[PDB]
Design a protein around this ligand. Structure first.
Ligand code: HEM
Ligand code: HEM
Ligand code: HEM
Ligand code: HEM
Lengths: 141, 146, 141, 146
C-alpha cells in the first residue's frame, strides 16, 4: 500500500515532470510499442509510425490521467472510476499489458530525472504505477 | 516441442479419445466466461452475458471446433510447430490483432477441461506433458508477431 | 470482486470437497512441482518424492487455510492476516508462483468434481483463488 | 530469444560505455529496495532495512559486480547464451535455489539503471534491444531448472 513517504515521493517526482507530462507519456508509448510489439494489437486503428501525432495525442491523455491520479492519490478508485470501466468493458485490455506500460513509464522517468530518480523514489513510483493499474483492472470481472 | 517419448505417447494416447467438437466448445466457452475480456473479439457472436448464453451460443461452439481442430493439427506435427503455425501466427497478428496472451489463457483453460473430462486419467505427469504442449503451441502462434 | 453468486459457488464447491481437502491439497502441490519445476526452489528441504509424507503434510495446511478462507469469505483479509504476514516477511515467495498453485488447485478440483465444476463454478473458484493470492501478497511492499 | 544484427550491435556498443562495478552495485541494490522479497537470499549481507543501508552495503556492491561480470561475459557471445550460462543455471537451481523470476526482476531494474545512467542516449531502439537481451539472459539462466 502507498505509505506517506510513497505519496510524497510520487508527488515530488511528478511535480518535476510538470509540463513535460504529455511528451513523457508519448515517449513511454513509443518505448512500449517498440520493446513489446504485442501491445500494438490494441491500437490497430492508430498511425503508429515514428513521430505520429496520434501517438502524441494519446500520450497526453494518458499523461493527464496520471496527473489526476497523483492529485487524488488518497482516493484513486473514485477518481479513476470512468477509466476503469472503460478499460474493463470497452477496451478489454489484458491485465498483463499494464505491467508493460508501467515499466516503460519508469524508464522514461529514469531517463529524464537524473537527480530525483533515487532508489527510494524508484520504489515509490513503481508501487504507485502498480496501484493505478490495480485500480484500472479492478472491474474486469 | 521438447517432449520425452513417454510424454509424447502420453499426449497422443489421450488426444485420440478426444472429441474436438465437444472439448472445443467447452474450452472456448469457458475462456469467455472465466476471462470475460476475451469476448472483445467476439461481439459478432451475440449474447455472451451469462455462462449459459456463452455455452449455448452456436458461433462459440463453431469457433471452438475450428480452434481445437487446428490445435489437433499441431499435435500431428510436434516436430515443426513454428512451421505449421506460421500462417496462422501472421494472421492473428496482422488481420485479427489478437494479443498473444490470449493463447496462454486458452492453453490453461484447455488443461482444466481435459482434467474435468478425463478425471483420474489426467494424472500429474500427463498434465505436465500437456502444459509443455500448450505452451509450445502458444509460442508457435506468437512467433510471427511484430 | 466476489459477488454473492461467487461466494455461493465457492461454498457449494468447497463443501463437496469436504474431508478430501487434505488429499486435494497434496495433489495440487504435486501437480505444481511437476508442471512448474521452478516452484520447487522454495521447498529445498522437502522430500518431493511421489507420496511424500511431507508434501501430504503441507497440502493439509494449505487446504486448511483455504477452508478457513471460504468460511470467512466476507472478511478474508482479517481472517488471513497472519498467513499474509508470514509470506510477506518470512517465506517471501515471488507473487508469480501464486498463479501457478491456483491453476493446479483448479485442475485438481476439475479432476475430482465432474458434476460440480461447471463454467460458472470454474469462474467463481478462479476469482476466489485470485483474491486469496492477492491477500497473501498484500504486505510484500 | 533472437537478436537481429542491429539489436546485438546496439547492446554491445552501449555496454562498452558501462562501468560494471558501479552499475552492478546500482542494479542489485535497487533490486533489493524495489522488490523487498528478494532480500531473502541475502540475509547474511547485513543490514538491508533501508534504501541507504542496502545501497551502501559493501557486500551488495561486491555481489552486484560479480553477477554483472558474468552478465558481461554473456554479452560477448549473444549467439550462445544457453551454453555460456548452462553451469550457472544448474548452480542457481541445485545449490542456490533461486526462483528464475528474480532474473527477470533484475533485468527490468537493470534497464532502469541504464536509462538513469545514460539519459537521452538510452533511446527507444536501444531499450528495445536491451529488453530482448535481458529476457534472453533470464531464459538462459533458467534453462537448466528441473
Ligand atoms: C497506465 C495505465 C493507463 C492509463 C492511465 C490509460 C489511460 C487511458 C486514457 C486516458 C484513455 C482515453 C479514455 C477516454 O477517451 O476518455 C485510454 C484509452 C485507451 N487505452 Fe488506456 N491507459 C492505460 C493503460 C493502457 C494499456 C496498458 C493499454 C494497452 C497496451 C491501453 C490501451 C488503450 C486503448 C486501446 C485505448 C483507446 C485509444 C483510442 O482508441 O483512442 N491502455 N487509456
Ligand atoms: C490454440 C490456439 C488457437 C488456434 C490454433 C487458433 C486457430 C484459429 C483458426 C484456424 C482460425 C481461422 C483462420 C481463418 O481461416 O481465417 C482462427 C480465427 C480466429 N481466432 Fe484463433 N486460434 C487460437 C486461439 C485464439 C484465441 C485464444 C483467441 C482469442 C480469445 C482467438 C481469436 C480468433 C479470432 C478473433 C478469429 C476469427 C474468428 C472469425 O473469423 O469469426 N484465437 N483461429
Ligand atoms: C494458495 C495460496 C497459499 C496458501 C493458502 C498457502 C498456505 C500456506 C500454509 C497454511 C502454510 C503453513 C504455515 C505454517 O507452517 O504455519 C504455508 C507455508 C509455506 N508456503 Fe504458502 N501458501 C500459499 C501459496 C504458496 C505458494 C505459491 C508457494 C510457493 C511455491 C508457497 C510456499 C510456502 C512455503 C515454502 C511454506 C513453508 C513450508 C515449510 O517450510 O514447511 N505458498 N503456506
Ligand atoms: C543476470 C543474472 C545473474 C547472473 C549472471 C548471476 C551470476 C552469479 C554468479 C557469477 C554467482 C557466483 C557463482 C559462484 O560462486 O561460483 C552467483 C551467485 C549468487 N547469485 Fe546469481 N546471478 C544473477 C542473478 C541473481 C539474482 C536475481 C539473485 C537473486 C535475487 C541471485 C542470487 C545469487 C546468490 C544468493 C548467490 C550466492 C552468493 C554467495 O555465495 O554468497 N543471482 N550469481
Amino acid at each position: 500500500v502507498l505509505s506517506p513517504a510513497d505519496k510524497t515521493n510520487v508527488k515530488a517526482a511528478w511535480g518535476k515532470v510538470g509540463a513535460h507530462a504529455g511528451e513523457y507519456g508519448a515517449e513511454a508509448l513509443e518505448r512500449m510499442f517498440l520493446s513489446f510489439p504485442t501491445t500494438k494489437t490494441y491500437f490497430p486503428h492508430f498511425d503508429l509510425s515514428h513521430g505520429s501525432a496520434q501517438v502524441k495525442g494519446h500520450g497526453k491523455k494518458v499523461a493527464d490521467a496520471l496527473t489526476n491520479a497523483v492529485a487524488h492519490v488518497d482516493d484513486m478508485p473514485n477518481a479513476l472510476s470512468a477509466l476503469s470501466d472503460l478499460h474493463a468493458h470497452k477496451l478489454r485490455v489484458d491485465p498483463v499489458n499494464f505491467k508493460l506500460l508501467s515499466h516503460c513509464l519508469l524508464v522514461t522517468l529514469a531517463a529524464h530525472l537524473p537527480a530525483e530518480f533515487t532508489p527510494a523514489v524508484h520504489a515509490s513510483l513503481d508501487k504507485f504505477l502498480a496501484s493505478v493499474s490495480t485500480v484500472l483492472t479492478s472491474k474486469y470481472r | 516441442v521438447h517432449l520425452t517419448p513417454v510424454e509424447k505417447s502420453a499426449v497422443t494416447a489421450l488426444w485420440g479419445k478426444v472429441n474436438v467438437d465437444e472439448v472445443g466448445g467447452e474450452a472456448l466457452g469457458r475462456l469467455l466466461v472465466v476471462y470475460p475480456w476475451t469476448q472483445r473479439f467476439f461481439e459478432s457472436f451475440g449474447d455472451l452475458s451469462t455462462p449459459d448464453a456463452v455455452m449455448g451460443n452456436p458461433k462459440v461452439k463453431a469457433h471452438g471446433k475450428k480452434v481445437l481442430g487446428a490445435f489437433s493439427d499441431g499435435l500431428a506435427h510436434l516436430d515443426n510447430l513454428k512451421g505449421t503455425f506460421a500462417t496462422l501466427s501472421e494472421l492473428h497478428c496482422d488481420k485479427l490483432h489478437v494479443d498473444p496472451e490470449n493463447f496462454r489463457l486458452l492453453g490453461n483453460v484447455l488443461v482444466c477441461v481435459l482434467a474435468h473430462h478425463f478425471g483420474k486419467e489426467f494424472t500429474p505427469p500427463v498434465q505436465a506433458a500437456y502444459q509443455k504442449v500448450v505452451a509450445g503451441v502458444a509460442n508457435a502462434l506468437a512467433h510471427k508477431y511484430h
